């Protein structure tokens, strides 16, 4: 189905004169495969997947050099932004960068992203057309003018439409056993009387890939949507994910409530009830 | 693969 490749970068200034922290991670769809950590003893781009280990030494050297270049760019950006916002050198701040490309199942270019944030707020982002920028405040406008004068959006367009898609296809082929797989959810429902007349039903879906999944509660044929305790999709640590959703129901009325499950690995949607 | 271009200081 639809596929995507995205890179995430986090750089944190640490209060004092200490070497700032830098962590880079790479994902194909919902599977992590590369990482870099400035506090690690390797100081190289490391693999976190079986199929990415087959790449040659020139690949790892180039990735190491490029991720180091990202790290140094963020090193400069911390002080630069600190000066932009008149912040003190006694505090700790954070720069975040994310970029990648999404395809439309047929492995053709669909979307491209490059976003940049200082602390936890948006700073600047490349628009959909990959030729214009969105600046958040009046210093991000200075950065925006600088990047327009240097034609950054053109280079990022060339990467997002060209190299990103090529290597996304190459990654999808190498390790097709893992990336192009689909794990069906293993589900069950639990009933708990919170009091004498009280009840609540938890709908559990486990060990599914990809992470996109839909669990909803329906009462007497119509969806409730708002009356539920839905949690964020979480990883199990083995490449699969878990998700559950609870609903409050009166005792003896558990059969009014049904749980509907939708996932790629299920050719037909599923419906569960308190059996 | 990482981007070898388009990474400019703010």
């Amino acid at each position, epitope marked *: 189905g639809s596929h995507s490749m995205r890179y995430f970068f986090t750089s944190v200034s640490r209060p004092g004169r200490g070497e700032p922290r830098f962590i880079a991670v790479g994902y194909v769809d919902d599977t992590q495969f590369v990482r870099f950590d400035s506090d690690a003893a390797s100081q190289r781009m490391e693999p976190r997947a079986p199929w990415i280990e087959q790449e040659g030494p020139e690949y790892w050297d180039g990735e190491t050099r*490029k991720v180091k270049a990202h790290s140094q760019t963020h*090193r400069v950006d911390l002080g630069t932004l600190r000066g932009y916002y008149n912040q003190s050198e006694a505090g700790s701040h954070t720069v975040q960068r994310m970029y990648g490309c999404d395809v439309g199942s047929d492995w053709r270019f669909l979307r491209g992203y490059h976003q940049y944030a200082y602390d936890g707020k948006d700073y600047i982002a490349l628009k959909e057309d990959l030729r214009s920028w969105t600046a958040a405040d009046m210093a991000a406008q200075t950065t925006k003018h600088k990047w327009e004068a*240097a034609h950054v959006a053109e*280079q990022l367009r*060339a990467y997002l439409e060209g190299t990103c898609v090529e290597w996304l296809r190459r990654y999808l082929e190498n390790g097709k056993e893992t990336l192009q797989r689909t794990d069906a959810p293993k589900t069950h429902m639990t009933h708990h009387a919170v009091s004498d007349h009280e009840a609540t039903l938890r709908c559990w879906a486990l060990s599914f890939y990809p992470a996109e999944i839909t669990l909803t509660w329906q009462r007497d044929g119509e969806d409730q949507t708002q009356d539920t305790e839905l949690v964020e999709t979480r990883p199990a640590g083995d490449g699969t994910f878990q998700k559950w959703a609870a609903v409050v129901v009166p005792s003896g009325q558990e059969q009014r409530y049904t749980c509907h499950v939708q996932h790629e690995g299920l050719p037909k949607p599923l419906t569960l009830r308190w059996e | 693969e990482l981007a*070898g271009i388009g990474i400019l200081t703010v």
Partner: T-cell receptor
Amino acid sequence: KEVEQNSGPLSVPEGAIASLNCTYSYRGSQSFFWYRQYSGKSPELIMFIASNGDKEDGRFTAQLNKASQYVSLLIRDSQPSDSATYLCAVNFGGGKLIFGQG
Amino acid sequence: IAGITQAPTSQILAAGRRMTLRCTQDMRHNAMYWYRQDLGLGLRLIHYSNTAGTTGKGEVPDGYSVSRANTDDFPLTLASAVPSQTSVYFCASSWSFGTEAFFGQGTRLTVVE
């Protein structure tokens, strides 16, 4: 490392189309440059190319195919002032920009 | 206008002496490069520097020192000049790593015994 062009020297008569080529080792290369160096001068940037395909700059044309690790430059209406050493530069990630023999 | 400048453009050295080629650039470029060209080949990468404060070792780093104390300057230092270091040294600079590099005027350097 490993950037190699047509060794040369080559000869093209005045007014004709000339063609230079260049290959590299790193498949992940994403930016490529053609420079012009007269004897005793510094490299003057002719062109750059990043995306696959062709790019037109006046009399000069750049072609790039990452699938075979290939880049090339075509010159229309070869003028006597075009006689020079043409350099092929490939970026190998970061600041490791490698030039061919010219 | 803004550009890039090397200094000197010519220097003769007695083997054993020390000499530093200065290179500066005004146009707010982050990346800077030091190349060595021997006229029997093309130029090879001596050193590079992605940002101000950081440096990198390249294709031919043996025997050369560098420093990137600030954005504008990226000098190349030869500590113990040997006759095999006779070459033409070029400095370059670029906005970002991987972008187009702009060269200076060059430096014809000849070390004699």
